[PDB]
């Protein structure tokens, strides 16, 4: 029977869905029985890099969401010493939940999809940011549209360890970074919604398969399909250099979103 003010107004707590390091999340209701989601940050063990890319995320977010409705809502926020409260869209589902309970993928949702994805990317881009780690748990399913919920600012946060398959392969020749590096990542999300694995899925050794991202002579293997385009789209994302992978303006004048 718990509950958060926030800017005055009070949140009956249904449950937890989501937690971090300091980081909680919670479907909630209002007083008048409506659905929202609060991120609830504790900052009291949290150094200034800590507290600053938190800052940082936020006035990205509310930034960023009035450009674009793929960018998920944030409704408002509280934020003190000792504390963040975000209140926001509740969606259904993160996208990862759903790509592993999801044995069938149906054309038309993954061409939707896949704009969604572009949509919210392009619109980060545009603002300067460049995610680069990009992968399924970054995006929410919320009346059948992907919205984009974290920004590679601050903290990953888990659906009540993680995967390397999406990770682009700059991402480990470094150690300035690309926009492309989105594109290796979102290639690989629509590689799964296509074929239903990642290209280096079956490689279940870390240092082999980073060996195989990073290979140019490691062919990934795309399967002929009815959707010729769709194809070539998986074929362009996925080249290791990104000088030669195409662009998001490139992909959102494609002939797979575009005909
Ligand atoms: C196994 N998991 C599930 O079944 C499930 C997952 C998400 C749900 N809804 C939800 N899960 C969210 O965040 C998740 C936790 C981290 C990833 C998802 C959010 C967020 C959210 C959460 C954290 C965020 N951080 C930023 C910068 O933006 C955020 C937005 C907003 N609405 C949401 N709505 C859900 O319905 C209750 C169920
Ligand atoms: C905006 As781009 C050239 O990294 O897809």
Known sequence: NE?????????????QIGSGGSS????????????????????????NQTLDSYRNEIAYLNKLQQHSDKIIRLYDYEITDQYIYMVMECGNIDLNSWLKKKKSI???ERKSYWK???????????????????????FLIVDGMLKLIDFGIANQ?????????????????????????????????????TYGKTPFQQIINQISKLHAIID????????????KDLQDVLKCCLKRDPKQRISIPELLAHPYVQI
């Not at 509950?3 to 449950?15: F, H, T």
């Not at 909680?24 to 150094?47: M, R, S, T, W």
């Open 3 to 15: 509950c958060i003010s926030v800017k005055g107004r009070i949140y009956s707590i249904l449950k």
């Open 157 to 193: 946060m888990q659906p009540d360890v993680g995967t390397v398959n999406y990770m682009p392969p700059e991402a480990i020749k470094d150690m300035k970074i690309s926009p492309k590096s989105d594109v290796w990542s979102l290639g690989c999300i629509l590689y799964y919604m």
């Open 216 to 227: 140019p002579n490691h062919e990934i293997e795309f399967p002929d399909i009815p959707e």
């Open 24 to 47: 909680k999340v919670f479907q909630v209701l209002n007083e008048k029985k409506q659905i929202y989601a609060i991120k609830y940050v504790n900052l009291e063990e949290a150094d």
């Open 106 to 108: 149906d054309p038309w």
């Open 116 to 138: 969604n994805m572009l949509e919210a990317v392009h619109t980060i881009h545009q603002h300067g940011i460049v995610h680069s780690d990009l992968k399924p748990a970054n």
